Amino acid sequence: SIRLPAHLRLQPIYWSRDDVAQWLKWAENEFSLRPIDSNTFEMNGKALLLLTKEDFRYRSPHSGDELYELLQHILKQ
Amino acid sequence: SIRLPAHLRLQPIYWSRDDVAQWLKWAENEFSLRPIDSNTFEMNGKALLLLTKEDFRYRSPHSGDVLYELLQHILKQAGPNIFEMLRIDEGLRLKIYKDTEGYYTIGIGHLLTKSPSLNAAKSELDKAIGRNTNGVITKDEAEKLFCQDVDAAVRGILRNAKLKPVYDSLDCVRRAALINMVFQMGETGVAGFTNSLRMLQQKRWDEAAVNLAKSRWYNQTPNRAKRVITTFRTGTWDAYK
Ligand SMILES: [Mn+2]
Ligand SMILES: [Mn+2]
């Protein structure tokens, strides 16, 4: 079970542009990833859900696959 | 789920160059994207469907992948392709006219009211529309009315126990032929074809074709009925090419 900040316990479809930016910042610290630029995912949650794993990898060569799977686990819960 | 403007509910292949520009403007707001230049995709829908995901990324480094996937989702959860079918069968009119009966109609066979005379008359709708159209609508407002009617026909079919199990078994092309009839004579009218609807469900194409051709509907509008029947019989667009 993965426990994220309170403001993000909302379904990813309702996440604002700023929410995904906070998610990125949280994931970076929680998972000891390489620094993620704040402008890597300039989009809201609805747009975040449209993206394939390949898109995550392209936007984040170091952590994309991890980020995508993290999202699938959040959706799964 | 994605809820796009009514006129863009038509399959992308019908999209004009202005349509893709409008899709872009909508997508930018719906998905909180970085501003999208209006000149990013200077082309119509047919051309947009030829581009690769790499092309989208190249043209929109910030949103290209999102736009491409958006497009894939729009294509995935079409929609029988019935726009040109009904364009041919009903016609496209931008200004109020009278049908074969005498009732005021506009767009693609959209009934406004059964009220007569020329004393305004109707004047609505005119929102629906609208806005004060004063009798004249755009291509897009005609597409809006058309999609609202298709949705009314589909929900009419899905709320009918004689039509729903038939529509469910039918393939994408034949579904359009069923909606075509519902568009022309209404839910209750098509539901009256009890025996013929049972034939289509059991895939008896030739038998259903012969049975439908003996109808009052066929006698009243032979040319159109023939085309709809041919669609039911072959499962192609041979009659509309
Ligand atoms: Mn008509
Ligand atoms: Mn249009």
From Swiss-Prot, chain A:
Q: Residue limits of the PNT domain?
A: 1-77
Site keyed Breakpoint for translocation to form ETV6-MDS2 in MDS: positions? L8, R9
Any S-S bridges, and between which cysteines? none
**UniProt note on tissues of expression:** Ubiquitous.
Give the signal peptide, or none. Answer: none
Chain positions of site Breakpoint for translocation to form PAX5-ETV6: R9, L10
UniProt subcellular location = Nucleus
Role summary? Transcriptional repressor; binds to the DNA sequence 5'-CCGGAAGT-3'. Plays a role in hematopoiesis and malignant transformation.
Family, according to the entry, reads as follows:
Belongs to the ETS family.
Q: How does it assemble?
A: Can form homodimers or heterodimers with TEL2 or FLI1. Interacts with L3MBTL1 and HDAC9.
Q: Which disease is it linked to?
A: A chromosomal aberration involving ETV6 is found in a form of chronic myelomonocytic leukemia (CMML). Translocation t(5;12)(q33;p13) with PDGFRB. It is characterized by abnormal clonal myeloid proliferation and by progression to acute myelogenous leukemia (AML).
Q: What is this protein called?
A: Transcription factor ETV6
Swiss-Prot record, chain B:
Where in the cell does this protein reside? Host cytoplasm
Q: One Pfam family, short name please?
A: Phage_lysozyme
Q: Which reaction does it catalyse?
A: Hydrolysis of (1->4)-beta-linkages between N-acetylmuramic acid and N-acetyl-D-glucosamine residues in a peptidoglycan and between N-acetyl-D-glucosamine residues in chitodextrins
Entry keyword set? Antimicrobial, Bacteriolytic enzyme, Cytolysis, Glycosidase, Host cell lysis by virus, Host cytoplasm, Hydrolase, Viral release from host cell
Q: Which GO terms describe its cellular component?
A: host cell cytoplasm
Q: Which EC class heads this enzyme's classification?
A: hydrolase
Q: Give the residues the record marks as binding substrate.
A: L111, F183, S196, N211
What InterPro entries is this protein classified in? Endolysin_T4_type, Glyco_hydro_24, Lysozyme-like_dom_sf, Lysozyme_dom_sf, Phage_lysozyme-like, T4-type_lysozyme
- Name the domain of life: Viruses
> Per UniProt, what does mutating T105E do?
Complete loss of activity at neutral pH; covalently bound substrate
The active site is formed by E90, D99
Q: Per its record, what triggers expression of this gene product?
A: Expressed late in the viral replication.
pH effect summary: Optimum pH is 7.3.
Write out the GO biological process terms: cell wall macromolecule catabolic process; defense response to bacterium; peptidoglycan catabolic process; viral release from host cell by cytolysis
Q: What does the UniProt entry list as the effect of changing N211 to M/F?
A: 2-fold decrease in enzymatic activity
User: Chief subcellular site?
Assistant: host cell
What the record says about family reads: Belongs to the glycosyl hydrolase 24 family.
Biological function: Endolysin with lysozyme activity that degrades host peptidoglycans and participates with the holin and spanin proteins in the sequential events which lead to the programmed host cell lysis releasing the mature viral particles. Once the holin has permeabilized the host cell membrane, the endolysin can reach the periplasm and break down the peptidoglycan layer.
Q: What is this protein called?
A: Endolysin
What organism is this sequence from?
A: Enterobacteria phage T4 (Bacteriophage T4)
Report which gene this protein is encoded by: E
